[PDB]
């Protein structure tokens, strides 16, 4: 009960790349930062397919637990961004 905004195109490059990837998986155009993946027509099978190309592209694991909990470009962009950053596992 918070995804009530109108379509808003991605404005940060990360968001912009994920929105493109969604268009290639869903076969539609106009993916926004607030577009709820499941509302667009996507489902679990599609969600797992997103993580497949993204894991190889962004070098990062995306479990369904994140995709389903936060089915939005904004969420994935931040979840991915914080992981792509320079960690210090040492």
Contact 14, 65 (CB under 8 A): no
Positive or negative: CA dihedral 68, 72, 78, 80: positive
Domain map (residue ranges) of the chain: 1-90
* CA-based nearest residue to 84, from 64, 58, 61: 58
Determine how many CB atoms are found less than 10 A away from the CB of residue 55: 13
Q: Looking at the domain 1-90, which fold is it? A: 1.10.1200
Experimental method, per PDB record = NMR
> To the nearest 10°, the Cα dihedral for 19, 83, 43, 69?
-120
Q: Which residues contact 48 (CB under 8 A, 6 or more apart)?
A: 64, 67
- What six digits make up the tokens of 71? 């089915």
Cβ(72)–Cβ(35) below 8 Å: yes
Give the Cα separation of 19 and 24 in Å (integer). 9
Separation of first and last alpha carbons in the chain: 41
H runs (alpha helix) in the chain: 13-26, 37-40, 44-58, 64-69, 73-84
| CA-based nearest residue to 23, from 37, 11, 13 | 37
């Amino acid at each position: 009960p918070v995804t009530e905004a109108q379509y808003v195109a991605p404005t940060n490059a990360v968001e912009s790349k994920l929105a493109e990837i969604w268009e290639r998986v869903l076969g539609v155009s106009g993916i926004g930062i607030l577009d709820n993946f499941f509302q667009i027509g996507g489902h679990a099978l599609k969600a797992m397919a997103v993580a497949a190309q993204v894991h190889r592209e962004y070098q990062v694991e995306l479990p369904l637990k994140v995709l389903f909990a936060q089915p939005t470009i904004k969420a994935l962009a931040q979840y991915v961004a914080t992981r792509s950053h320079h960690h210090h596992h040492h």
